[PDB]
Amino acid sequence: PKETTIFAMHLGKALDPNLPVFVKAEKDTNIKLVNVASQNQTDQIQAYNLMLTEGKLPDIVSYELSADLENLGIEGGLIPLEDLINQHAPNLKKFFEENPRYKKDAVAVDGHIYMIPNYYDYFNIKVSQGYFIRQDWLEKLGLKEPRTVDELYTTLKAFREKDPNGNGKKDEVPFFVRANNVRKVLTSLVDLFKASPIWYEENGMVKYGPAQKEFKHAIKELSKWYKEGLIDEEIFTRGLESRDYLLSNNLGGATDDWIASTSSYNRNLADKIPGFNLKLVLPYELNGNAKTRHARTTYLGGWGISKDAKDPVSLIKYFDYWYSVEGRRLWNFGIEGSEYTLVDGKPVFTDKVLKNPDGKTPLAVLREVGAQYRLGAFQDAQYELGWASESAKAGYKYYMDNDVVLDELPILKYTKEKSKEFVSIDTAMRAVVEEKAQQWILGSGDIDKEWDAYIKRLENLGLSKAEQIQNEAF
Ligand SMILES: CC(=O)N[C@@H]1[C@@H](O[C@@H]2OC(C(=O)O)=C[C@H](O)[C@H]2O)[C@@H](OS(=O)(=O)O)[C@@H](COS(=O)(=O)O)O[C@H]1O
Ligand SMILES: [Ca+2]
């Protein structure tokens, strides 16, 4: 065993190296992680920024924001990995040969690799969230499946007014989302209206979604729907438990959320709510547009080796372990004999994952054992196919075949100087967007009177300078 310090968090939770997956990795690698993030920290961004101030860097630095990792590397806080990989990491070396896009994702603008991304299995599943509705409530109310945003409005109003859960109470929550910050609330609300709260691509050009006319229209409509009780009153204040809470209590009528986990509730709730059918639909059309911008990026965050690590060779071998057949299987599937067994040589999940007795989704079970824990690993779509229901599996194909998903932006890279300029604009604009969007949706103020002042407000923070940086990076 080697004590190896790490800064690692994901989904609000510091890595516990005694989770089943990491106990197995420790046994296979002789690397014993010790986390410098503590079990009480939940805000990964603030924990990371604080961690940079605390003297020596941990041996391994994992982080959800890859530009900050490349900046740390340009400053000399993380070391270049590409020669270590060449000499000592045959699995990563092979992976970079077989995957040009992923290799390009790992190279900073100065030509060094400062981090190994945590890659989605992007070329096998790139769809992410999809639109779902209570087909059993549609049938109960004799309603057609809505296809346009206007039809969705009519349906959600019916869900609010007509007691589809049959209890004589006006408790229905027609539309809800699942989010742990305001940006992610907006993400699952404004895409209905073909708007975006982030930067996106239009024909090779990068634009800022909150400055676009579609966003104004999205906020105006959401304001109306919120006043009429069509949108969850508590939309900005629930955490990630919203979906479990609203579905298991038979309150939620419709959502926009990840396809496999959201599809898991039909089987999960089949006994507590007879006939529960939360069904995938294609994105609703608005003025001829049937597209969704919900898509995976090629990766999310990454991890690197700091200049303070006394044995960087043994750490790149640790990084490489996760790209071996057994390491990548462990990271994705959990523990052989517990989460899965090998059937005809390939993992098949057990009832512990597929039919959890407390009603956890399969993914929530896997996260409990330390699987899918974002670091610098390569997700295997065979794991997602392993637990996805038949209707989730058909639904990836339904979204792909109908061509409704717009590809996400590549993760953009910067020099350290351009990153510093961009974030001082981008983070300030973010705060304005989130302040005004909540204010407008919650019904204070008036977007029509206020829009032009808001746009000017973004411009005065440097909107056009950030637009220039984003287009140079793309
Ligand atoms: C790389 C990573 O961990 N991504 C998180 C998402 O995990 C995906 O979730 C699902 C699914 O829900 O069907 C399928 C993919 O295999 C997973 O990589 C997801 O995590 S979570 O388990 O739902 O919490 C999102 C959730 O955050 S959100 O509701 O705010 O989008 O977080 C991504 O980190
Ligand atoms: Ca009711």
100 and 216 share a domain? no
Indicate if ligand 1 lies below 6 Å from the C-beta of 374.
yes
Task: Measure 330 CA to ligand 1 centroid, in angstroms.
Answer: 18
Give dist(CA 442, CA 451) in Å, integer.
16
Give dist(CA 390, CA 387) in Å, integer.
9
Q: Is 460 part of any known ligand binding site?
A: no
379 and 429 share a domain? no
Which two three-digit tokens encode residue 182? 């305001």
Q: Is 188 helix (H, G, I), strand (E, B) or coil?
A: helix
284 and 302 share a domain? no
Task: Measure 363 CA to ligand 1 centroid, in angstroms.
Answer: 9
91 and 46 share a domain? yes
Q: Which residues contact 413 (CB under 8 A, 6 or more apart)?
A: 66, 67, 70, 108, 109, 473
Q: Is 172 part of any known ligand binding site?
A: yes
Please work out, in degrees rounded to the nearest 5, the angle formed at the alpha carbon of residue 319 by the alpha carbons of 314 and 321. 90
**Beta-bridge partners for 20:** none
Give the resolution value in Å. 2.0
Nearest CA to ligand 1 atom 16: 384
28 and 67 share a domain? yes
Indicate if ligand 1 lies below 6 Å from the C-beta of 260.
yes
Indicate if ligand 1 lies below 6 Å from the C-beta of 183.
no
Task: Measure 128 CA to ligand 1 centroid, in angstroms.
Answer: 9
Alpha helices, DSSP H, located in 121-258: 135-140, 149-161, 182-190, 213-227, 242-248
Task: Measure 401 CA to ligand 2 centroid, in angstroms.
Answer: 36
Q: Which domain holds residue 90?
A: 1-123+298-387
Give dist(CA 333, CA 353) in Å, integer.
10
Residue 155: closest CA among 288, 291, 73, 254: 254
**How many domains does one find in the chain?**
2
Q: Is 336 part of any known ligand binding site?
A: no
For the chain, the maximum distance between any two Cα atoms, rounded to a whole number of angstroms, is 69
What type of residue is 381? A
80 and 118 share a domain? yes
421 — phi, psi (to 5°)?
-60, -50
Give dist(CA 282, CA 392) in Å, integer.
13
Last residue of a domain, one of 387, 415, 442: 387
288 and 324 share a domain? no
179 and 286 share a domain? yes
Give dist(CA 241, CA 361) in Å, integer.
12
DSSP codes of every residue in 109-144: TTS----EEEE--TTT--B-EEEEEEHHHHHHTTPP
User: Based on the number of CB atoms within 10 Å of its own CB, is 248 exposed (0-12), middle (13-18) or buried (19 or more)?
Assistant: middle
442 — phi, psi (to 5°)?
-75, 0
119 and 232 share a domain? no
| CA of 240, closest atom in ligand 1 | 29
Q: Which ligand is nearest to the CA of 161?
A: 2
Pocket test for ligand 1, best of 66, 116, 261 (most atoms within 8 A of CB): 261
Length of the chain: 474
55 and 159 share a domain? no
Indicate if ligand 1 lies below 6 Å from the C-beta of 384.
yes
Q: Which residues contact 190 (CB under 8 A, 6 or more apart)?
A: 196, 197, 209, 214, 215, 218, 219, 222
Which one-letter DSSP state was computed for residue 359?
-
Output the CA–CA distances (angstroms, integers) from residue 170 to 75, 165, 173, 442, in the order listed: 58, 9, 9, 20
Last residue of a domain, one of 336, 365, 387: 387
Question: Is residue 419 within 8 Å of residue 67, measured between CB atoms?
Answer: yes
| CA of 364, closest atom in ligand 1 | 22
Q: Is 91 part of any known ligand binding site?
A: no
Q: Which ligand is nearest to the CA of 169?
A: 2
CATH number at residue 68: 3.40.190.10
Which two three-digit tokens encode residue 14? 């510091």
Last residue of a domain, one of 341, 366, 387: 387
Give dist(CA 346, CA 385) in Å, integer.
12
140 and 261 share a domain? yes
Task: Measure 15 CA to ligand 2 centroid, in angstroms.
Answer: 41
Kind plus residue range of the DSSP H or E element containing 62: strand 60-63
174 and 261 share a domain? yes
User: Based on the number of CB atoms within 10 Å of its own CB, is 127 exposed (0-12), middle (13-18) or buried (19 or more)?
Assistant: buried
Give dist(CA 147, CA 377) in Å, integer.
38
